[PDB]
Amino acid sequence: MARIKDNNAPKRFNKISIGLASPESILAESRGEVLKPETINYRTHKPERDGLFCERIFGPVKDYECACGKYKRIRYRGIVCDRCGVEVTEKKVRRDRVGHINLVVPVAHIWYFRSLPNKIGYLLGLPSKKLDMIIYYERYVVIQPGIAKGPEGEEIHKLDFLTEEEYLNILESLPSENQYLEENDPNKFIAKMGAECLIDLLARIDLEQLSYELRHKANTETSKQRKTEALKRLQVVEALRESQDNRENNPEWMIMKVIPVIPPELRPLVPLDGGRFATSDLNDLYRRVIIRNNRLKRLMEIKAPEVILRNEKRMLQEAVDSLFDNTRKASAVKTESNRPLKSLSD
Amino acid sequence: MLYSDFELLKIGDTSALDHIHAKYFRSILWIGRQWLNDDFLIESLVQDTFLKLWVNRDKLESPEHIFYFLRFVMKRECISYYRKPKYKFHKKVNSLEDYDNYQDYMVGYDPVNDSENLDEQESTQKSFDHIKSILPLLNADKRHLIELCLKYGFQYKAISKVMGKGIHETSREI
Amino acid sequence: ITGGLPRVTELFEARNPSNPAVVTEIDGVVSFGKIKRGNREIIIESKAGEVKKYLVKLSNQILVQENDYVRAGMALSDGSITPEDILAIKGPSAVQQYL
Amino acid sequence: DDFINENDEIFGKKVVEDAGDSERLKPGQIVTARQLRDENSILRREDKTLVTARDAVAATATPILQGITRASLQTKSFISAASFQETTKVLNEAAVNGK
Amino acid sequence: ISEKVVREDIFTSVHIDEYALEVRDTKLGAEELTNDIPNVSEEATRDLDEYGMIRIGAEVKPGDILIGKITPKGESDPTPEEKLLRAIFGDKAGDVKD
Amino acid sequence: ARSIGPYSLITQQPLGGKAQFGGQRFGEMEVWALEAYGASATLREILTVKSDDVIGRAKTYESIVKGETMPEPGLPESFNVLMHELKGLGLDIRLEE
């Protein structure tokens, strides 16, 4: 017979708006959380529970049939199940339903610190090399000097880069009561490494005050290069300010706490002749991200040393970078035949 | 007093692990690359080797022993992946990027198959509706037998206790 | 024949030629200054006193001489009259027509 | 066109240097002549310090010849620019600026 | 060119094509090669032998079956309704897909 | 020759190749020629109802068979694939009226 005449006509639109995506929006649009790095079970070749192809999150595979095959045919639309929780609807919903991964540690988005100009480092004011040192877990950066002094008593300034030895030494000289102080205490000494420091710094930022300060610095500088740098940072600051008028667009959303997962029909997994399978690289990249996140969560569960956590967090950042922009990496992820994987930006 | 890294590990000081890591990381990476070809899995196994050295730090006796431990453990981890069905299955899967312009001539479907499947579903539904319409014409006991058998499902035992007839009688009536 | 497509691409992309000839922008007397890092300095003092300094590679031939008076739009050295120099000197309609 | 529109918008307006005792105007704020006159009259009626303002300064610019590639990459539509070249850069700027 | 070329077989060639079918052991069951394949008229399986393989000398018109095959279809959990429907009507929809 | 046939499961567009019973490619230069001629309608049919408007192509086949008016085209599926990739890159793309 003829196709069912879907009366849901597409909603006409005249504009497209783009902006940074908040974690709240990613969670609100998502149907679930991908918890396993599996795609299909190797013994049954069926989508795995809570995996990248999960029928609980992304939709049924068969038309008007659930996973356990108890509810069938059009009579049972909208009934998910009592047993396998898989909605009885059209399989085409596997092209529109998305998922997410809740990262245990925030990971910076590669774009906003690799596609020049360096957006995060222009907002914070740090040069790109130091920002990379922050991101790849090599130095601590102080967000609030507090009452902490230097090793010889020198005043500690905001945005100071301290190694592990320096951080431990400074934490030693701190009073015992200061470590337990609330984050709103002006005297608390806060130093962070990785993407959490960037989150805190970009949250504490004030765009209007920063723009006025940069205009003042450009108007009262005797160096042409310093003026050029000031105006270049002013460009990005004013771009963010203009973005904040149309929608809500915050700098902290450049550091991602949730990783969205695209519908499985756009990252297929097909069976070929000879009994082999062929998968999209996006499945592999999501697998790497999930594996790193799960390993980091387990390591924190057992109170691992502070070098294993650092290595795992840096590896997780690298995995997310490979997922988004593989070519921009210094050492792009490659197959055994030395062919770089294809990411979302590729 | 500048103790050697062996006694730092024995004491329970975490910076010791930083020392052994910074010293033997590349050697263990080479050891892993000798046995496997996946850098991701090799890095995972290196992290596991160092963490398990830290966990078994109460079993070392010599400064060189530490190194030996690392190497030993890391090797066996690689070896275990020769047996894991998950790893074999995931390494038996190619990448669609290996076929140039795979989106043009591969991963295809025909809507005729979907329409035929829906038509078959409609045929089955019509047959079941015919059966449901026939049901009221039957004797009341045999109608309730079928109705129960369609909402619990050919459960001769639980139906027999529900009814009063035995397993044999209930099966015969069904 | 094939030396035409790269030229069209260079012109359409507003690319400077491989030999950008320095062109004087004001009318005045030309003088030769001190040589700086292998590049001769040409100092042009205008009728009203405006002083403009240009750098010309010594390897490139110098068309103008010392104690000479030149008008705007004249090349001080051998090369191709670059489109942006034409824009700066003769105007936007002139550069459009030249292009 | 944007340059002309901005110059026309700022034409006839004034930038406040000192807000005085006015609770509605702030230093660095651009307001129209009528609004400034009304605020000054209101302050005078209240025997408060008058607001001092200076004439807005129009920006100065020169015509520039751009290559076809750069002109295509600098279009006002980010969909058009992202489908030609440097997709990551265009999408980054579009997201940061909320185009 | 003249029609004599076609008349005298001057520029006539022979081109051979090879079509290969794999029947493997899948989880749902071992796929079989047979001339009895569901929902196809008896005319379209006239030239096939016992192993569902076209005879030597047949004319391969477009759309004819060369190597007929049945793959075990996807029986889900046998819901009671399906059990009764098969019990009364029969196994008309035997578990085999073309 | 192809009227309708197999489509892709990713892009929802006709496949490519005689063996795959695919359709011909109307590339960028063909679109440029169509724009130069000024054919909005032909370009629109080529973009939406002949390639990847999943509902639109079925409705158009039915309308040609039944003689009725042509359906109103909808959003192409490749645009939705693009939007999902952009959302997977962490960009909030919003279509507004």
Ligand SMILES: [Zn+2]
């Ligand atoms: Zn179910």
